[PDB]
Amino acid sequence: SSDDISMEIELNSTKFETITGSDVGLRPPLYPTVSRETLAFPFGKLSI
Amino acid sequence: PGQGTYVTLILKPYDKNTHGTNRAFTIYYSNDATGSGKFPVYSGSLSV
Amino acid sequence: TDNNPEGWTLDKSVNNGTFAGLAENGVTGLLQSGEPMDFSGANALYFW
User: In chain B, which residue's Cα lies nearest the Cα of C20?
Assistant: First the structure.
């Protein structure tokens, strides 16, 4: 699930699109396949 | 620490053609006034 | 191009941007001005 999540802040006219493949080497696996387990994608101090 | 960048290099599995025979790999960096020497920044055994 | 601390150009100029050992769209990890706490560095003993 590489680079699957991404934040795209929209500025007054512009926008700046950062993807997690550019932040984290840690990937929350779909395993534990057991149901209703949610995952977390932490972003590090996005100096936008 | 100081000025510089984090870099997450992802590498392909072992192929006998592109990697030669030995499965080990070391990745360097330089500045680079090519001929200015490069510093080994990581060594490892590339996976299969 | 700028004095951004985390800004280091992904996929730089005319050079292909690949060793032929990574051969994927995954290089980046270029943001994240911060790394996690180190458990094998100088203060490893105190953290452990």
Answer: B18
